[PDB]
Amino acid sequence: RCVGIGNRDFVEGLSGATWVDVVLEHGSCVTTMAKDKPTLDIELLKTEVTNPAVLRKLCIEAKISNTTTDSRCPTQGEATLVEEQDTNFVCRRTFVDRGHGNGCGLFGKGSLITCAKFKCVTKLEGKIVQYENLKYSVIVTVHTGGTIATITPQAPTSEIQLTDYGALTLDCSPRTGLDFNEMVLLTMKEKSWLVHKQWFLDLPLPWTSGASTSQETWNRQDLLVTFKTAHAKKQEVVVLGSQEGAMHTALTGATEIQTSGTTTIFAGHLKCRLKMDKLTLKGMSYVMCTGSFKLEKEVAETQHGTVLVQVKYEGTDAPCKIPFSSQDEKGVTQNGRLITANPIVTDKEKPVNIEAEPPFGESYIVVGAGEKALKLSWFKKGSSIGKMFE
Amino acid sequence: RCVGIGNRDFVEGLSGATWVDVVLEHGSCVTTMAKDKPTLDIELLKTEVTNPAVLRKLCIEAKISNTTTDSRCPTQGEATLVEEQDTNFVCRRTFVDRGHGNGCGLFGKGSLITCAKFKCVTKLEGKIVQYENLKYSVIVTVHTGGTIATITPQAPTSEIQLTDYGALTLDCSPRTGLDFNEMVLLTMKEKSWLVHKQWFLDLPLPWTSGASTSQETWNRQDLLVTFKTAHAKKQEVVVLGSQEGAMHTALTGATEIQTSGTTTIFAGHLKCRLKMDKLTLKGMSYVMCTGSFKLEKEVAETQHGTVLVQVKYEGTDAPCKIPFSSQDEKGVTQNGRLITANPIVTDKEKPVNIEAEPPFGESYIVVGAGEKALKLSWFKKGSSIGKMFE
Amino acid sequence: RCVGIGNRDFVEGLSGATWVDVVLEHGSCVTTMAKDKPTLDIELLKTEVTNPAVLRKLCIEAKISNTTTDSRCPTQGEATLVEEQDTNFVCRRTFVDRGHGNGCGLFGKGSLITCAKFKCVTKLEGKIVQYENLKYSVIVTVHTGGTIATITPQAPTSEIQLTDYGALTLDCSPRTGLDFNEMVLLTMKEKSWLVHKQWFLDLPLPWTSGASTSQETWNRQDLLVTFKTAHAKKQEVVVLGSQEGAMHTALTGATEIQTSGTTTIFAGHLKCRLKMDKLTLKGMSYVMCTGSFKLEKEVAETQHGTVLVQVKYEGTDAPCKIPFSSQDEKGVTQNGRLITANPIVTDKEKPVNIEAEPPFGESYIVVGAGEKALKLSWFKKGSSIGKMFE
C-alpha cells in the first residue's frame, strides 16, 4: 500500500549520514528498506488547526430595546439623552415639526434625539491561522510485525529511536498550497469555511475587534438598525432580520470545512527530510503503466488553483508509475503542473488520487500513455476573492 | 555563456543519487557535465503572473446625473425621495430657508433632500498575487547538438527524461525577493505598478470590493461628489475631475511593470535542487579576476532594498570570479550582501549583472581586487510604503 | 562551550562536496572538526531590524486652537467658514435657537458652523518589518588560536575563505517563529512592542498614512475632539487628554522590545547549510544525561505559542543530551514539540535554555529520565490578537 522510495530521493554519504526526501500526503504512505533490515513506513495521519485567534466578530442578527426619545420645542434648545454617552446605545439626531398641536407655542422645528440599545443575537467569527495553530501527526512504523511524531511549523524536527535503524530525525514542513496569510477561518452557527481575508474585512456588517474585552462594543450598528420617521415626541427604531441567509448565499463556492470545538481538520501535505546514520538503502523503481485508466469519480476543483483526479487502473503491470501530462488550449505539453509526489498504482484495485495545477483558461489533462490515454478538457477561471455579500 | 557548477554545489552519494544546487536568474544559465556525457544547461526563460484576483476597484473619475431634489415647507414635515433607498444614488439632507417668497406660509427652515446617480467612468484595480498566479518556464538542454519545464509554487517539482542522463527532477522554488503578501499589482488605464498593500487600501478614493457582483456598488462616493449650496427647491450636485494625474504623481517611484492582458512578466529568480541517479559530475572552478572592471551603466535601485550593478571586465583571465565586497559608512567589510549566485565573467566581452543589498545609510560597493578595484559610494534610504496621494 | 555536530547532520559526497546542517541560536555555538584540521566554530552574534517602514501614525494626544464659529439668523441662510476647506481644521454644523435676544428678528433655528485647528502633540507609530529590514551577524572561527558573515533574507548566502578548510558557503535562513506578516513594530515615546497587525489597524485613534507627505493630515479627528454645546454665536471645542495610559494598559502582555534609533535587536534563530569541499568530518555523539536537572529560573512564556525553560544539570556525565518529553493533559507523549536543535549539557556548571511548543490546554513538560525527572504541569491558552483598547 506504500510507495517505495526511489534512489533519486536519497544519498548515502561516503561518511556522515543517509539523507532521504519524502512527501507525505493524506492517504498515501511511503516506505523503504536497508541492507538487510526491516521495512520502514512513514505516513501522515492528520492535520489540525487548534484554537485560532479571532480577527473580528460580525453581527448577522441584532435586536433593539430601551428605545428612548427626547424632544424640545423650537425655543427650548437642543434635546439630550444620557445614553448618548453609552456605547451599547445607537443614537440619532434630527429636527421635527413642533407647534401648538403638540405642546409648543411656536410652529417650527424642534430638536429630537433618539437612542436605542443594540444587542447582537447572532454573530459569526473570522479566525486567523498562525504557526502556533498548526499541527501534524506523522506515524513511523518499523515492520518487525509504531511511533507517532508531532510536527509543527515552529517545531518541524522530531528525533525518534527505531529498532534496527537507530535514531531517525523527521525534518518536515508544510507543502505550498493553502496560504493562511490570505485565507481566514469563518465560523457561523455550526458550519465553517475558508474565506479570503479582505473579503471578510470588507463585509458590510456590524463588527467588533477580536481583542480581549469585557464589554462587547460594536461598530457600524447603523447597518442593522433603521430609525423610522420621527414624530414630535416619539420615534420608532427597528432592526434588520437575520443575515444568515444572505451570508450562506455569499459563501456559495467557498470551501466548507469540519471543526469540532476549537479544532479544524485539514487534508495536510508534508515534505520531509529523513536523517539517519550512514546506511545503504534499497531504492524502489516503478515502470510506467501501460494499460488504461478509468475515472472512478468526477474531476473535483479546489479553491486555490488545483483539481483532484481519482483514477482506476485497468492494466496488468502494477505496481507502476501513472503517466501524466498537461496541455494548454493548444496542445503544448507543460512538463510540470503535477502536484502529487508519488503518482503510483501500487495496487490495481485501489483508485489513485492525482492533484494537478492546470493552466488558466482551456487545457487538457492526460493520464495513461498512447491511444489508451484518458483525455479530459478543462477550463480554469481566473482567481477571485469570493462573492459579493449583498 | 553558462556558468559552470562548482563541486561545492553537488554531492554524489556512495549510494542513491547525485544532488545538485543551482540558482537560475534571468539572463544567466548554468551548466555541468558528467563522467563522459554531453554538456547539460539549465536556464530560466520567463516568469509570469496570470489572472491575479482583484482586491478592490477604485474610482478616479466619476460622473453625476438624475439629480433629484425634494423640499418641504417648515410645517410640511421631512422631505423624502425613493432614490434614498437606491444604492446607485448618493444623497444628502439639510434644512433651507423657506417662506412666502417660495410658496410657504411661514418664514422658517424647510427640509430638503437631494439625491444624484453616481457612476464610475474611470477606475483602477488592485490585484493580489497568490501562489496559483505565479509560473516559471525553465529550459533544460542536453548538448547532443531542449525541454521546457513548468515550475509553480504549488508544483515546484518537474521530472524530465534526458538523453544519456536519464530522469532529472527539477525541484525549484522562488528566491526571497519580491513579497506578494506585501506588494500589490495596481492597474490604471494601461500602465501597471507594484505598490504596497496598505498604501493602496488607505487610498482616499471611492472603492468597491473585488468580490463577484452583478451590481457595481461604490463606497465613499462623497470623495468625488460635491453638493453645492441648496436653494428652496433645488440644489446642484457636481463631481471632481479625473484623478489620473493625482495618482500618477503619487505613484512616482513605484516600480512600473509590463502586462499584456491578464499576464504580467517579471524578472524571476529560482533556487533549484536537481536530482539525478548516482553520477560523478565534473565540477567547474573559477579563479578570481585580476584585471579591471568598468561600469557599463549607472547603478540602478530596486524598490525592495537592492541595487543592480552591471560591469565590464578589462582583464585577460576570463572566465573568472568577480571579486565583490561591501563596506558600511566606516570601512567594515560585511562578508555578505551579495545576491547574485554566480558572479562570473564567463565572457570578457559580455557585461555582468550584479545584484547586492547595501546597508542602510552610507556605504561602499567594491568590484575587483587591489588598487584596480572599482569603488562606489552608495546611500540607502530607510524603507517606505510609498508617497501620499493628495 | 560549543555543541558538536552529529554525523546525522552532514554527508561527505563520494564526489562533490561535504554538506552540513546546523541550527544557530542566540547564546549557543556549534562546532566540528575534519580529518586532521583545526576546530571550526559557528555562532549567531546578533539579529537586527533596521529602518522598518511606517504603516500608519496614530495620535494619542491632540490639541485644539483657532476655534472659529459662524452663525446666521433664521432668515439669513447657511453659515460658512473658509476653514471648512482646510484639512488642518475639524468642523461641525448645527442649528441653534436664534431670536430677538441675540440680534435676530425671528425666534427660530439659525445655522451654525464651528471649525477648530487640530494638531497631534503625541503620536505613536506602527512599523512593518520586511525582508530588507532583517539582518544577521554570524561569526565563523577557525581555531588556529574570526570572520563575521552578514546574512539577510534576500542575501542568505555568504562565501568565506578559511584557513586549512578553504572556501565555506554559509547558506542560512530564519527559522519559523516570529511572523512579520502578522506582527507589527509599535513605537510609543521610547518603548516598543510587537503587536498583531489588525489589532493595530483597528485601534480607535486618529490616524494618518505612513506614506510620504509634507502635510501631515489626520483621519478620525472626532475621536479626540469634543464640540461642546453651541450657543447663538459661539461654541467651545475641547480635546481629550493623552491616551498614553490607555495604550500602556491595552499593551499589557504584548512583548516589549529594545530599539536604539532605527535599529531593533531580536533574539534570532537560523538554520544553515554549510557547503565545503569533499571532506571527512568528525561527528560528535552525546549520551543521554542520567542525572537530575534543576530549574534555574521560572518557565517563561512567549507570545507566539512557545515557552522557555532554563535548567541546570546535577549529574556527572557531561557533556550529555538532555532527555526531553511533552505530554498532553492525559499522558500522551508527543514525540516532538522540541524547538531547540541542540539540547546539550556541554558544561555541568552552565544552565541550558530549552524552547518548546506545548499543546493547547493542560500538559506536562519533562526534562531528565526516570524517577530523577523534572515534571512540570503547564496550561496553554488559545491564541489572541491582543487586548481591547478602551
Ligand SMILES: *[C@H]1O[C@H](CO)[C@@H](O)[C@H](O)[C@H]1NC(C)=O
Ligand atoms: C431598560 O431595559 C429594562 C426594561 O425592560 C431595564 O430593566 C433596564 O435597566 C434598562 N436598561 C438601560 C441600560 O436603560
Ligand SMILES: *[C@H]1O[C@H](CO)[C@@H](O)[C@H](O)[C@H]1NC(C)=O
Ligand atoms: C433618469 O435618467 C434618464 C433620463 O436622462 C432616465 O431615462 C432614467 O430612466 C432615469 N434613471 C433613474 C434610475 O432615475
Ligand SMILES: *[C@H]1O[C@H](CO)[C@@H](O)[C@H](O)[C@H]1NC(C)=O
Ligand atoms: C490662528 O492662530 C494664530 C493666532 O494665535 C495665528 O497667528 C494664525 O495665523 C492662525 N491660524 C490659522 C490657520 O487660522
Ligand SMILES: [Cl-]
Ligand atoms: Cl402642530
Ligand SMILES: [Cl-]
Ligand atoms: Cl422668502
Ligand SMILES: [Cl-]
Ligand atoms: Cl432669544
